[PDB]
């Protein structure tokens, strides 16, 4: 019996790690299970293009082509279907024309100035596939869905002759009061951090830098004496998004004193050191840090294989 608890701020990747355990250890999502995520995929897609369209109003960005204004009108006329798990060719055409517009793209590339699902581009770039008749979400489509977690999710799987119970909680501010309900009998905490959060602000609070929020939570959890004997695993997640972002968005937005280059290795290491330095007991408390892409099954499989070996050695 091994109890794993996933913790971290909102949208850090916790529930995506959960989905990966099903894919890796329990043979993935069945066809009926994938069909259940169809409405979620469509809902995320519609919400993402709408979120960009909303931002254009706030940021005063015009459509590149004036013909798009009528498409934008038709979007809201037809959007109701997607929410119910249906995607007509007509709605798909509207979204596709909107997504390709240079004004919409300009707004998309300023997404740090508002709140946009990380999977927006993933779904929007794949419209021809997901709009097809009898579309059934792939494992990756399922991995890419976003639903804010409320309450506590408990999942089971077997791995290396061990029976794992994995607990997942919401990370947004409204849900943090529920974390304590999960504090008993924890073998290991997997604390997830979105590396790409460094230039974002909280959905709950536009004045709070997302990564500063994550640091405060990690500081709180890592140094809590209740967890002295609980293995602390740190997943620096969304490394794929971070790799792309670091090229174009200065890390100094988050850490004014960062003097390294705009490249993956130096910046990733610097963030790791920022979190690890929050550990007030470096000689007596180890943090097991891994860089992850939670949507990437192979990456998660090898990482969690390494993590599991640590957990076995240190708690068994
Ligand atoms: N590209 C990419 N997307 C990721 C990665 N990790 C998670 N995501 C995506 O980010 C979104 C949020 O991840 P999710 O697992 O729901 O966060 P959470 O920690 O559970 O969020 P919450 O329930 O506390 S609000 C999901 O759409 C998921 O597919 C990643 O490493 N790379
Ligand atoms: Mg979640």
Do residues 160 and 25 make contact, with C-beta atoms less than 8 angstroms apart? no
- Residue carrying structure tokens 């905490």: 189
What is the Cα–Cα distance from 234 to 275, expressed in whole angstroms?
A: 9
Please indicate whether residue 172 is annotated as part of the active site: yes
Residues 6+ apart with CB under 8 A from 47: 117
The tokens of 200 are what? 């974002």
The tokens of 301 are what? 């499989």
CA angle, residues 272, 276, 279, in degrees to nearest 5: 165
CATH no., domain 30-148: 1.10.400.10
Name the CATH topology of 1-29+149-316: Rossmann fold (3.40.50)
Would you kindly state where each structural domain of the chain is located, as residue ranges? 1-29+149-316, 30-148
CA angle, residues 26, 27, 29, in degrees to nearest 5: 95
Residue 115 Cβ < 6 Å to ligand 1: no
Cα 84 to averaged position of ligand 2 atoms, centre (Å) = 22
Residue 44 Cβ < 6 Å to ligand 1: no
Obtained via which technique?
X-ray
For 223, list phi and psi in degrees, rounded to 5.
Answer: -100, 5
What is the Cα–Cα distance from 173 to 234, expressed in whole angstroms?
A: 20
CA angle, residues 244, 68, 102, in degrees to nearest 5: 30
Residue 213 Cβ < 6 Å to ligand 1: no
Cα 285 to averaged position of ligand 2 atoms, centre (Å) = 27
Q: Which of 35, 38, 95, 45 is nearest to 71 (CA)?
A: 95
Ligand 1 mutation pick, 19, 118, 153, max ligand atoms within 8 A of CB: 118
CA angle, residues 92, 95, 96, in degrees to nearest 5: 80
Q: Tell me the β-bridge partners of 166.
A: 4, 155
* HEC secondary structure over the chain: CEEEEEECCCCCCHHHHHHHHHHHHCCCCCHHHHHHCHHHHHHHHHHHHHHHHHHHHHHCCCCCCCCHHHHHHHHHHHHHHHCCCCCCHHHHHHHHHHHHCHHHHHHHCCHHHCCCCCCHHHHHCCHHHHCCCCCCCCHHHHHHCCCCCCCEEEEEEEECCEEEEEEEECCCHHHHHHHHHHCCCCCEEEEEEEHHHHHCEECCEEEEEHHHHHHHHHHHHHCCHHHCCCEEEEEEECHHHHHHHHCCCCHHHCCCCCCCCCCHHHHHHHHHHHHHCCCCCCCCCCEEEEECCCCCHHHHHHHHHHHHHHHHHHHC
Residues 6+ apart with CB under 8 A from 86: 42
The tokens of 112 are what? 């740090």
Q: Which of 41, 50, 12, 238 is nearest to 140 (CA)?
A: 41
* HEC secondary structure over 262-289: CCHHHHHHHHHHHHHCCCCCCCCCCEEE
To the question of whether residue 168 is assigned a binding role by annotation, the answer is: yes
Q: Which of 71, 101, 141, 168 is catalytic?
A: 168
């Amino acid at each position: 019996e091994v109890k794993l608890l996933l913790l971290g701020a909102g949208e850090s990747g916790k529930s995506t790690i959960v989905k990966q355990m099903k894919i890796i250890h329990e043979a993935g999502y069945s066809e009926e299970e994938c069909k259940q995520y169809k409405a979620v995929v469509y809902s995320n897609t519609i919400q993402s293009i709408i979120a960009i369209i909303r931002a254009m109003g706030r940021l005063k960005i015009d459509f590149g082509d004036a013909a798009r204004a009528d498409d934008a009108r038709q979007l809201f006329v037809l959007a109701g279907a997607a929410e119910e798990g249906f995607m007509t060719a007509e709605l798909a055409g509207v979204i596709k024309r909107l997504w390709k517009d240079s004004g919409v793209q300009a707004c998309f590339n300023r997404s740090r100035e508002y709140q946009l699902n990380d999977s927006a581009a993933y779904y929007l770039n794949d419209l021809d596939r997901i709009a097809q008749p009898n579309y059934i979400p792939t494992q990756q489509d399922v991995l890419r869905t976003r639903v804010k977690t409320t309450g506590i999710v408990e999942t089971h799987f077997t791995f290396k002759d061990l029976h794992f119970k994995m607990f997942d909680v919401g990370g947004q501010r409204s849900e943090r009061k529920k974390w304590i309900h999960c504090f008993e009998g924890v073998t290991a905490i997997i604390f997830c951090v979105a590396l790409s959060d460094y230039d974002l602000v909280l959905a709950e609070d536009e004045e709070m830098n997302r990564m500063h929020e994550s640091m405060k939570l990690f500081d709180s959890i890592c140094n809590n004496k209740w967890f002295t004997d609980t293995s602390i695993i740190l997943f620096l997640n969304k490394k794929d998004l971070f790799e792309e972002k670091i090229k174009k968005s200065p890390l100094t937005i988050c850490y004014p004193e960062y003097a390294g280059s705009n490249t993956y290795e130096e910046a990733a290491a610097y963030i790791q050191c920022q979190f690890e330095d929050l550990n007030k007991r470096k000689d007596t408390k180890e943090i097991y840090t891994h860089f992850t892409c939670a949507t990437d099954t192979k990456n998660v499989q090898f990482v969690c294989d390494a993590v599991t070996d640590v957990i076995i050695k240190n708690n068994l």
